[PDB]
Amino acid sequence: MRILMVGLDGAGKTTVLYKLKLGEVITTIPTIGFNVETVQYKNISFTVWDVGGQDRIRSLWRHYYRNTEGVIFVVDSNDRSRIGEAREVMQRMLNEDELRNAAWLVFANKQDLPEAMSAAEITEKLGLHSIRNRPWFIQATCATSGEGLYEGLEWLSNS
Template sequence: MISNFFLPISGGQTSIRPYWRCYFPNTQAIIYVVDSSDTDRIGIAKEEFHAILEEDELKGAIVLIFANKQDLPGALDAAAVTDALELHKLKNRQWAIFKTCAVKGEGIFEGMDWLSNTLKAGGG
């Protein structure tokens, strides 16, 4: 069974975070969406991201990161999001980052294609 896990990082989500564990069993992939224009909270996004990766049931999951809101002025590019999230620390799992603009549909299909191909190849 393949289940995708999407973690929105936005205000007001703190109260439902304990319920995320309900989705951990059998998860092969994590889809993590980052608001690239919210530079004030990128540190919080990093902390949440690394905390979720430490969960035992998610140790083998591959990671797809969407660096969203690329259409907004001042948005961090994929390299800057990679640095901010410290993705270079992910040594024992497959991951990829894609620049996206959800309102325009840009980058989403490319990321999902990577995820699908990686899962088919036995990456998760």
């Protein structure tokens, strides 16, 4: 299974990936580029493309769209200023023809932080209810603990 994981910078995309691959919480640098890794979960081998979220790189995601079976969209639940921006990025991503049938999994992340928005709140802000054309799911996660990560891999594998 081919997976594209994106989201704004600092959402926690690489932390998520290497928690999944190494069971370890690594010390990230901003990703100017991608990381690509293969992860085994329950007889599925997920090839995850973690593509950096800062602006220059954001402009490049479209090259990773093609062949994508599922999309992990990571959100920093503690950052309320950038939630609209996330909504804007994700909405036009939903309009992409190469992403047309891909399974849509939102991770509301850093759920560990006291003022993190809830997954329900995030669902309203991102406009997730309005997707009728394909599968979507939202999952509260904490990438450092590992909470919600495998519930994500589970949902994804049931595409």
